[PDB]
Structures are given as structure tokens and as C-alpha cells.
């Protein structure tokens, strides 16, 4: 269920309902999403089980789902896994006091984090100095800027370090005219595509980076 | 401009 496109984890402590009815918001409002659009993420109650959240014309519904490899809503249908849970879901719809068949899964803007290239709090001089210690074209970084859901790809070319801006415009990014689902979708792109003139991105750069192809001091 | 243009 880790890569499943709804499969958010844990998010936030307990602030995860409130953020979980957030992003299934955003994402609903936005792209004009169907009823029963979704998300599965940790409990912050139910330690160990998972918590369904799902759209309903404009509310947001919550289900328990418990684990114990057995998942289920209703001690009636156990499954083996939240993936057979979820694609069970999207073809016969679950009860309540209304009846829901899942729809669309809600994927997160936020894999980028995990990433070795992504720097949450790193200044332009700051990004400026590592490429510096880099002597390789196409070294590159991205750093959160201080505007929200503003980015910025630090990369060196031609000897120098260039910047781009990257824009999280709801539930897609924007580097100028070109859009991207998401800020990974965006610079797995210009892995295999050149981001500047001639150049694309080749060298990931971190603290672990620059002791392995790294010098002491910079150009 | 600071940052680079894409098109």
C-alpha cells in the first residue's frame, strides 16, 4: 500500500484528521473531483489502524479501518491487505446510516520530502556554496523557498550555479510554461530532459554527496 | 531576474 497513490501515512500528531479533510479539499475543489474521492492514512486514535477519509459534496467522511494480516470496516468482510480493502471499495459501495462506492484515489503533493535531492530550509547562498564544491555540470538541488508552495532548483551549468522557480499551483507544479503533476514528476522530467540549454539533472547533491564527489572549500 | 527562464 506504500506507493499507492492514497496511501498518505501518517500525517502532521493528532492534527491528522484536520489535514487529511485539507488535502481531500484542495484536491476535490480544485480538480472538480467526484463523490467518494479519497485518502487512507494512519489513525491518531486507533493506534496501529488506518482511518478512511473520503469526499461526500463537500463534506468530509471518516471510517475506521482496523488492523490486526486482517483490514476491514465492518467485522463482516476482512481482507488481507488495505490495497484489496480499497480496490474492493471502488467496485461495491460501503454502508452508513448513505451508501459511498470509492472513487478517485487523492495523491500526495509532498514525496518530494523523502527525496536526497530536496533541502526543506536551505538559502540561495547556501545552495550557491554546496554547488560551488561540486565540479560537475549538472549537480543539482531543490530547496523550499519562503513564499508557500515555492520551490527552487539550484543547478550548476557553464561553471556557474543557475536558479529556476518552481510552483506548486494547487495540485500541480509549474516551472514556467511547463506543468507537472508534482514536484518529483517535475525533476524525474528533467532527469531525462534538458532543464537548462544543454543540461539535465544529474547529480543529486546532500551532506552525504559532497563528502563522496565533494571538495573542502568552493570555486 | 535572479532565477532563469524555461520555455
Not at chain 1, 471510517?63 to 471499495?89: M, W
Not at chain 1, 514528476?185 to 547533491?205: A, F, T, V
Amino acid at each position: 500500500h506504500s506507493n499507492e497513490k492514497w496511501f498518505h501515512g501518517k500525517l502532521g500528531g493528532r492534527d491528522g484528521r484536520h489535514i487529511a479533510e485539507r488535502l481531500l479539499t484542495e484536491y476535490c475543489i480544485e480538480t472538480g473531483a467526484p463523490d467518494g474521492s479519497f485518502l487512507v492514512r494512519e489513525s491518531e486514535t486507533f493506534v496501529g489502524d488506518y482511518t478512511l477519509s473520503f469526499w461526500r459534496n463537500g463534506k468530509v467522511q471518516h471510517c475506521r479501518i482496523h488492523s490486526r494480516p486482517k483490514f476491514f470496516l465492518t467485522d463482516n468482510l476482512v481482507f488481507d491487505s488495505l490495497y484489496d480493502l480499497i480496490t474492493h471499495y471502488q467496485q461495491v459501495p460501503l454502508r452508513c446510516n448513505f451508501e459511498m462506492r470509492l472513487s478517485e484515489p487523492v495523491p500526495q503533493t509532498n514525496a518530494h520530502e523523502s527525496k536526497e535531492w530536496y533541502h526543506a530550509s536551505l538559502t540561495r547562498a547556501q545552495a550557491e556554496h554546496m554547488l560551488m564544491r561540486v565540479p560537475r555540470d549538472g549537480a543539482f538541488l531543490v530547496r523550499k523557498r519562503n513564499e508557500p508552495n515555492s520551490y527552487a532548483i539550484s543547478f550548476r551549468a557553464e561553471g556557474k550555479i543557475k536558479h529556476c522557480r518552481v510552483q506548486q499551483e494547487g495540485q500541480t507544479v509549474m516551472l514556467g510554461n511547463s506543468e507537472f503533476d508534482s514536484l518529483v514528476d517535475l525533476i524525474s522530467y528533467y532527469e531525462k530532459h534538458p532543464l537548462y540549454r544543454k543540461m539535465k539533472l544529474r547529480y543529486p547533491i546532500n551532506e552525504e554527496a559532497l563528502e563522496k564527489i565533494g571538495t573542502a572549500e568552493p570555486d | 531576474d535572479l532565477y532563469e527562464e524555461v520555455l
